[PDB]
Structures are given as structure tokens and as C-alpha cells.
From Swiss-Prot:
Domain notes: The coiled coil domain mediates homotrimerization. The RRM and the CTD domain are both required for proper RNA-binding activity.
Effect of residue 107 to K: Loss of LINE-1 retrotransposition without affecting RNA-binding
Protein name, per record: LINE-1 retrotransposable element ORF1 protein
Cellular localisation: Nucleus, Nucleolus; Cytoplasm; Cytoplasm, Cytoplasmic ribonucleoprotein granule; Cytoplasm, Stress granule
Effect of residue 128 to A: Loss of LINE-1 retrotransposition without affecting RNA-binding
Organismal lineage: Eukaryota, Metazoa, Chordata, Craniata, Vertebrata
GO MF terms, alphabetically ordered: identical protein binding; nucleotide binding; single-stranded DNA binding; single-stranded RNA binding
Post-translational modification: Polyubiquitinated, probably by UBR2, which induces its degradation.
Listed result of changing residue 56 to A: Loss of RNA-binding activity
Effect of residue 66 to A: Loss of LINE-1 retrotransposition without affecting RNA-binding
Organism of this sequence: Homo sapiens
Keyword Cytoplasm: yes
Keyword set, alphabetical order: Coiled coil, Cytoplasm, Nucleotide-binding, Nucleus, Ubl conjugation
Region of interest called RNA recognition motif (RRM) domain, as start-end residue ranges on this chain: 3-98
Main location per the UniProt record: nucleus
Length: 176
């Protein structure tokens, strides 16, 4: 599911799926010795893109890696950030992923709610994409959209007052 972007892999006439897979494994060993030792990396597919359409830019085409375990992919990214230097066969390369701007906006919207809950010993935590979860009265509650949070507070006046400013549900009668 989780897809990773590998940038800076030179091209070769003899390129083929098998060789590509070996390449990724090599990267792991070169920069992430820990990952290589574990040997718990399950890759589903590795291919070059665009396979049939030439790249408008003079730079080398990118390789897309699809990992079986989303968690595993995330770990790899973290490792790269820590090392500060990732190389393939001694040459410098870059490892990154594409993220949607919508996600960032969501986090900002939840900003007020998160901070207030922290102060009040609610233990607020955020999970990808932008789901809000926290512990209240001894039980764990999860909400995906701010709309849910509104429907929830209606039944606990204390909570409503605390979050009143966070949700800003006192501007326009209509939603959106």
C-alpha cells in the first residue's frame, strides 16, 4: 500500500524488474545496516515510471517502490532522516514521499482542540491522516471529522465549554 519514491537511479539498456528489486535491497544495506540485519523487508512490486512515456525533464526517471507493510515503509523513511546521507553505489541519491496538502490543513484545524486537551490532562494524540483520539472519563474516544466532535460534546456540557473555542462552531449557522 505505502509507496516510496527513489530518485537518482541511473538508467541502463539492460534494466529489468529483477535487477530493480536487487537495487532496492542494496540501498537498504548501504545506508540502513540495521534494516538489513533484521531481514524483515517484504517488497511487493518495483517498477520504473513512466515506463513508456519519456520524461519531459532531462533528469533521470524515478523508481516507485510499493511495500507490503505500510509500517515498514514509514520506518525506512525515518532511518534516512536520521542518517542524513543516503547513497547508491557511492553516488548521492534522495529518498522521499509525496504528501497531500489537504492533510496539512486538517492538522491545523485540529490544532486548538489538541492543545486544550493537553492542558486538561486529556492526553490528546493525533494519528494519520488527521484523526483525533483522546482519553476521557476512563474510556477512549475516536473522531474522524470535527462534525463528530460537535455531536459528541452536546452530551457532556463540561466538554462543550472546554472545546467551544477550539471548534469555532459559533460563527455561521450553516456548515462549510
Amino acid at each position: 500500500m505505502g509507496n516510496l519514491r527513489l530518485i537518482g537511479v541511473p538508467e541502463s539498456d539492460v534494466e529489468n524488474g529483477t535487477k530493480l528489486e536487487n537495487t532496492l535491497q542494496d540501498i537498504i544495506q548501504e545506508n540502513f545496516p540495521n534494516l538489513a540485519r533484521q531481514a524483515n523487508v517484504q517488497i511487493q512490486e518495483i517498477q520504473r515510471t513512466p515506463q513508456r512515456y519519456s520524461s519531459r525533464r532531462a533528469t533521470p526517471r524515478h523508481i516507485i517502490v510499493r511495500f507490503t507493510k505500510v509500517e515498514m515503509k514509514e520506518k525506512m523513511l525515518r532511518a534516512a532522516r536520521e542518517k542524513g546521507r543516503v547513497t547508491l553505489k557511492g553516488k548521492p541519491i534522495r529518498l522521499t514521499v509525496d504528501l497531500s496538502a489537504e492533510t496539512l490543513q486538517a492538522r491545523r484545524e485540529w490544532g486548538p482542540i489538541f492543545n486544550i486537551l493537553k492542558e486538561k490532562n486529556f492526553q490528546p494524540r493525533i494519528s494519520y491522516p488527521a484523526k483525533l483520539s483522546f482519553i476521557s472519563e476512563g474510556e477512549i474516544k475516536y473522531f474522524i471529522d470535527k462534525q463528530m466532535l460537535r455531536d459528541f460534546v452536546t452530551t457532556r456540557p463540561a466538554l462543550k465549554e472546554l472545546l467551544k473555542e477550539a471548534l469555532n462552531m459559533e460563527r455561521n449557522n450553516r456548515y462549510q
